[PDB]
Each structure stands twice: as C-alpha cells, then as structure tokens.
C-alpha cells in the first residue's frame, strides 16, 4: 500500500468496549456520609451519552467497597480482544486518591491496577479511560475576575 | 541502546484519568442538574465526539466548567466558588471515537 501513519488508537474493532458506570448515591448510615442528590441525573446522562458512542454500558448503583473491587476484578478478567477501549465512570464521595463505596473507601490505584498492561492482556495497547466525579480534598477555589 | 525496547510498553501506559476537579479540591454537584463536570462532559461529547480528538473535547469541558459555573450558597464559606477539572493523560496516541 501507500505511506502509513500510526498516530491514533485503532477504534474500529467490532465493539467500542465496555462503559462501567458506578453510581453511589446512598451510603451506609455508619459511615456518616450524605446522600449524593442529583447523581442519578449524572448516571442517566452518561448512560445515554456513551450509548450514542456505541459503548456497552453497564450501570451499577450503590456498591460497597467489596462490590466495587469484585466488579473491577471480574471486568478486568473478561476477554476484551474484540473491544477497542475500556471506560469506567466513578460517581461517589472521595478524597485525594480515594473513591468511596457505600460502606468505606477504595484506593483508586487498587481499581486501576486491575487494568495494568501486565494484568489485563486483552487491553494492552488500548485506551483505558477513568472518569472520576468525586472530591479530591477540601480546598475551595475562590476564582479571580477576568 | 536497546532497539528491542519497543517490544515492551510501560504497564501504566494508555490510561487517561478525567478528574472532575484539581488535586486537593472539592468537586461541585448540583442536586437538580447533576455535577458540573458530568453535565459539561456529556454536553461536549454529544457536540464534538464526531469532530474532535478526545483531549480537545476534554479541554472544551475544562473551559465550560471553568467559565459557566459558580456556586451559590447561604454559607459564606461555600459561596461564589469555582472549579477546574484535571485531565491526566498517559495515552500514547490520539483518541477519536469515530473511525473511517
């Protein structure tokens, strides 16, 4: 053939890939964490948006820390060979480096490590997108006039 | 030198983290309209996923969140606050959601 360039990810696999949406609204009373009103609006918007991008969307609601880890582990062990990419959306309480299950925290590194190139071979070389709606601390940005 | 270097890639390569807010900062949600970041992300994906590379879409999300949103609170501590999302890219190629 003619001259080739390799600057963009191959996105014409038979499937775009999974889009896992974890939507934590209600938290166990013992954690002391408030209900995240409005998060169902987010989850529905994301479901529709990624559906239109031809992702296989899976919506999960109100997962414990143990359920989040098990879900991620199981998804990382699926065969992604026919999929172009992987998307995970996390909607929850958080702190720097941390997302909350309904009963306590999960290190974000624990979640993303399941998809490391040496631990998920069928996603090697493919984009792994993590979209995180959660606090990263308690600082507030006062802004500046423009 | 090691021309066989290309035979391995870093295990941390090809991740993209689209954070709603800057390191250390709160992230804002609206109880009626949803979170500022997810509102803006979905709007920009709907408008530009057939037109722009993903990092440029996320830059438009950054601009939308930064310019169009400001908090309203009866509590002075939390009133009139702003937010900037944070794109963290370990990607090695351009990402388009469409193909030829």
């Amino acid at each position: 053939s003619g001259i080739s360039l390799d600057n963009s990810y191959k996105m014409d696999y038979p499937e775009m890939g999974l889009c896992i949406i974890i939507n934590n609204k209600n938290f166990h009373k013992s954690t002391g964490m408030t209900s995240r009103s409005g998060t169902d609006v987010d989850a529905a918007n994301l479901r529709e948006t990624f559906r239109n991008l031809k992702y296989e969307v899976r919506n999960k609601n109100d997962l414990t820390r143990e359920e989040i880890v098990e879900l991620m582990r199981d998804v990382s062990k699926e065969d992604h060979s026919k999929r172009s990419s992987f998307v995970c959306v996390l909607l929850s309480h958080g702190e720097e480096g941390i997302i909350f299950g309904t009963n306590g925290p999960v290190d974000l590194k624990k979640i993303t490590n399941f998809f490391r190139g040496d631990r998920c071979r069928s996603l090697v070389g493919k984009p792994k997108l993590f979209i995180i709606q959660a606090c990263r601390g308690t600082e507030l940005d006062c802004g500046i006039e423009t | 030198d090691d021309d066989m270097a290309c035979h391995k890639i870093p295990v941390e390569a090809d991740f993209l983290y689209a954070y709603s807010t800057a390191p250390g900062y709160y992230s804002w949600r609206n109880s009626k309209d949803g979170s500022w970041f997810i509102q803006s992300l979905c709007a920009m994906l709907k408008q530009y996923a057939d037109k722009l590379e993903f990092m440029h879409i996320l830059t438009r999300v950054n601009r939308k969140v930064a310019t169009e949103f400001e908090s309203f609170s009866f509590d002075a501590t939390f009133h009139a606050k702003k937010q900037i999302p944070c794109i963290v890219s370990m990607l090695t190629k351009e990402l388009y959601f469409y193909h030829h």
């Binding site: 959660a134 606090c135 | 992230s27 804002w28 949600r29 609206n30 908090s71 309203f72």
Partner: peptide
Amino acid sequence: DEVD
C-alpha cells in the same frame, strides 16, 4: 450546589 453541594460538594462531594
């Protein structure tokens, strides 16, 4: 508007 709420933080989380």
